Chain length 167, copies 2
Amino acid sequence: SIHMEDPILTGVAHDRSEAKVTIVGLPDIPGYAAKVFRAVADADVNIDMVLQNVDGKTDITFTCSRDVGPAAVEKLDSLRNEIGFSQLLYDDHIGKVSLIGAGMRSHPGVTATFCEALAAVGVNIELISTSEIRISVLCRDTELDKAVVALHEAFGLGGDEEATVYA
Amino acid sequence: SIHMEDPILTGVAHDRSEAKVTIVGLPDIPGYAAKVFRAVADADVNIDMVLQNVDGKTDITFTCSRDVGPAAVEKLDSLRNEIGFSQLLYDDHIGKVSLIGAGMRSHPGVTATFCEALAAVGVNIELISTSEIRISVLCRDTELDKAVVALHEAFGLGGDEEATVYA
């Protein structure tokens, strides 16, 4: 489409078949995080919403599609000695809702308006990731439909044959 | 340039003047997270690497440029009653190193190779965010130069007048 000084919003996406994985109690020593990502690449699972958070320990979280969810954690567990973790967390009752677009990163107001919209329909955010081209949140599947609606409303979308330049 | 089935890597970026902000002890109730982002938008600070992690409480983390770092936390603190947090964390001795590109998200191996490269020069990852178009990590400023080098080496870049289609 239009593929400027204001952000372009091309749509609202949603995926109901999502899994959330947390590796708990990772040594904060160089090498260990890399093993986590190598294991996932070796197992051929495309991951998203990835983050690291803090003992001398750290946790890593990501999502992936449910269908490969169990394959992910198995691979991960098969390397419990080499990766130093104490626990693997798993949540397959969540879905991802997203604002797609471009140039979103210089306008933090978009993210705030994104969240204000979900809050207004009492949607709870479990994870959030943002980029130039996507703002995604992870929530329970029971709330995906009201989230999509709220987003469409808040941003004047749409078709989605519509795109918008939002101010 | 070239702006395919393999990822395009257009460069390695680095920014030494970075600040890391953590809002600690946020009520996991709809509305509060949105207040955090609204405060930042109101204060006109472009944020990045944003994440939410877990009591009934949650934490949010992000980065921004140092020059506006203190303005961020001030704004945040000015709303300590309305936002429910117990603590604000602040780190201005870190920098961001990034792999720029497109189509990176279907190849988790890139992220793993990214991390393997930093691990090999004993760089510690404090934050990581990934997208189709950027993989960034936050580390101490004392390690930025060796990180940039290691990345260039690992991915056959570059100029950066070079771009690569990596396999």
